[PDB]
Amino acid sequence: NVEQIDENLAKFLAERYTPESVAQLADRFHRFGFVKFDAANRLVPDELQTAVREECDLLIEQHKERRNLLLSTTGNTPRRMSVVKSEEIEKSELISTLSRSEVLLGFLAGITREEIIPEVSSDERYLITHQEFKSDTHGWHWGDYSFALIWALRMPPIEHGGMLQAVPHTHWDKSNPRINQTLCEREINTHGLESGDLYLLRTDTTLHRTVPLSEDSTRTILVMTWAAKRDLKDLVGNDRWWENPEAEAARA
Amino acid sequence: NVEQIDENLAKFLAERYTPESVAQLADRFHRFGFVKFDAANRLVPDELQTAVREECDLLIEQHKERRNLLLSTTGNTPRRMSVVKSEEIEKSELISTLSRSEVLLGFLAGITREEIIPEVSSDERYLITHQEFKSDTHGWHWGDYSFALIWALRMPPIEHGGMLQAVPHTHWDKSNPRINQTLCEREINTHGLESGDLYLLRTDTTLHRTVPLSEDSTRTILVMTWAAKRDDLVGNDRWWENPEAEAARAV
Amino acid sequence: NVEQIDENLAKFLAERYTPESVAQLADRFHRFGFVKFDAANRLVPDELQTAVREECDLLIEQHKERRNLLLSTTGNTPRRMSVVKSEEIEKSELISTLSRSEVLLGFLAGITREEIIPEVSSDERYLITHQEFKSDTHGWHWGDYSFALIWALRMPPIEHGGMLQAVPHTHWDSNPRINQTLCEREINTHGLESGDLYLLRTDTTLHRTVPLSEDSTRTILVMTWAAKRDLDLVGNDRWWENPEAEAAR
Amino acid sequence: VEQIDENLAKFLAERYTPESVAQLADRFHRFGFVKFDAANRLVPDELQTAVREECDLIQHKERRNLLLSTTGNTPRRMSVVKSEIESELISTLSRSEVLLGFLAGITREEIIPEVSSDRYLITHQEFKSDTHGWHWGDYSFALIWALRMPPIEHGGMLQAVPHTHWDKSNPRINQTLCEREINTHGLESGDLYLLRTDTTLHRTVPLSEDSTRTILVMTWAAKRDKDLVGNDRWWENPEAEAAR
């Protein structure tokens, strides 16, 4: 009921978090560019995530688009997955209002320590990626915007791959990504996830990817992309492979 | 696959459990009739559970059977669920071999503090319950056998119901179940479950049930029933194998 | 300090508590007659605790009075400890001001769910108990007043004893029936660590401290408060302020 | 009374598995440090209480206040008890084959009690500025008994830098700190920890006020462990030239 969702989520977060504990999560987010909301520290009520997982699962069964390309602006890292564009996820009233919820964005703003602005490009507001076959992966890349709340809806067993790897405190130079060079100079943090987890990712300064699936499994995530004040900046690269599969940077 | 699963499991358990921590779990088992293996205290590797889940998913879509009955031997409590009979689950080489694994049965024997014998009735070796609709429930009852390892494969949101309620330290008298009377005299322990959890249940002396679903959802579990040394079957109440058993009532 | 204690305590508590989580503490307080403020639920900043403990250490060395009698109004339960009188602790401006602090009583009122009135008897306003030898205990008893905030300033290891044992939802009678109540009810034992604070519903919770197994230091501070029901007093058993009370033995 | 190796081998067998100990070995090799706390006890609580009582040997309480030259003039401000300790309880457990056998699964190599009889060390820091300054160890292994630990807000934590080496002529202390990160290990009363004392630069943080920090060191040795150089040996001989 939108207003009832926010009123409940407010109580839900007030039952689990305090200003001191959020400040500890803010420290972790700035150190790793990543904070995980697992069974210990939940972010949304289990009934709410179920509702989100069902609305996403329906969008996959109808709108799934296979992608298998290389993105030149990220050192030609692979993008082997199925996607659901943002223009089609925006039809879901639940996912659309929740991604602009004053309660959710305000709570997470305590972790980012800066205003979270739900005003990003229409083709990037929401993204659903669905990896099914072996070698499927979201290759090393950066995000155009500052923040993204990722819903780890369905994750394979950790022995099948699919983990999130991350290198924080970097930046995206599209004219020269230096992806493999950065790995040589920095330690990689591997973040395993379990079905039901959510995590906040600082997408613009954290080089990240998903470990390829070593065997046929199912990896479904929902991405809510948000902006910071620094992102409100012209979009460059012509590398929007999730919307346009034959972008000027998408080589196959 | 095959006998390599016992070696993987023997390592999986050695990495997490010690005789001291198992003895602590054994204390909880006798106190509650219930020990939960959740995200903190896993029991089987994630890949192994996924393989068991996928085998049960297929068994459901292949040989599901709807049950909607009351059981006279358990005070006419409702059984409202779909099931897959033990005869069909035994077609799974993985599930049947894992139900008789010496390392799995051996580890759990430290929690039961007694030998776990994998010799039970052929219509009760395995069982799958599939609750899908509102008011679906596995009503108040006991187990004819002592032990049951329950795989909480798919569990609905906690706000929709489906929790295990239990009353430990009771007994099943099929001529006078005294279920509602036991509730009046004893406290009820409610056990929330999440998808992926397993739990060991002392089914003969723990009055238990699943909280009915408050809305359409999905609740899928697998039952591995084992026997103790204390375990002749009476009651004519084997409703999961025979929907028209003597004790099975209608409406 | 003085008026700085309130601004510091209000800022300290507002960062570690929400009205929703305080409600969860209020449930636990009505259930067990007891709620512990430990490393997971701090109540005062570390500086305020140090100043209170440091002040309490001086009051112990200067004016220690040992008690060792049996109280008839609590079934002849033993009271083997050293104590410091209330009028003595009232001289400390820090303890007296913190005892009436609108921020402290205001926060704790959300746990009791009723008004906490700092109007009690002059001889029972504050209390320090120091047990140093074996077989020392504050025997089974109740409280004449509703609420008491206890400062577990120095607590021995659990293996030495000194834990708080409690039976909530009782009352204090001419006929205490203490061992009978233990037979009919079951006892909650609450272990305490150095620096812990806990709120106790003293009028309805039969409570004691487990006797010391060996020589060990056990130092606490009681800040007794009252509720609306505590506004008529009897017993002739005020042993802490009068060791020659009519109930002592 | 030789009844310790039996009660210890049972105490450890029900609290550790070979795969659990292998995880402790990785932690020991990476940090040079493995702490035995409430989650991973090493001795029964009665045995430690007997050691804490036996050590409380301090009968030999000799204060120290020097600067060791082979460690860049880092301070040594504490009391000591000389290896006086060789009490039959500490001596028997130090050569206990069950204890040295289990701990060898963490070091991944055999540990030998054949060390200089100069063996056991009891540290007793009391006043402020008391510290066991930056240093290494002439021997590989040492099991430290944090018998009594002040609260963390006062100091006493162990700061360690693994994967280093001791050059008595050029200790390179502050320069090593600039190039390596410092691991701070907080300790509580009752914890024990195994320390690779030769390749781990370590120290205790100086106490911020008068407190009580009591420790017992049982220095063992390894096969790769030579000659005693530096003329340091400050815990034994207070006037050993290498002091200050």
Ligand SMILES: N[C@@H](CCCC[NH3+])C(=O)O
């Ligand atoms: N730029 C990202 C896509 C961002 C989608 C929203 N976080 C990539 O190359 O995969």
Ligand SMILES: N[C@@H](CCCC[NH3+])C(=O)O
């Ligand atoms: N006795 C149980 C059936 C157990 C089947 C699984 N072991 C009941 O009446 O519901």
Ligand SMILES: N[C@@H](CCCC[NH3+])C(=O)O
């Ligand atoms: N009346 C209590 C002591 C109360 C002290 C003030 N709260 C007793 O008999 O021990």
Ligand SMILES: N[C@@H](CCCC[NH3+])C(=O)O
């Ligand atoms: N060699 C160390 C002392 C070790 C004493 C024996 N465990 C130092 O220079 O401080």
Ligand SMILES: [Cl-]
């Ligand atoms: Cl991204």
Ligand SMILES: [Cl-]
């Ligand atoms: Cl059953």
Ligand SMILES: [Cl-]
């Ligand atoms: Cl009282």
Ligand SMILES: [Cl-]
């Ligand atoms: Cl050393």
Ligand SMILES: [V+3]
């Ligand atoms: V991304």
Ligand SMILES: [V+3]
């Ligand atoms: V009292």
Ligand SMILES: [V+3]
């Ligand atoms: V040393």
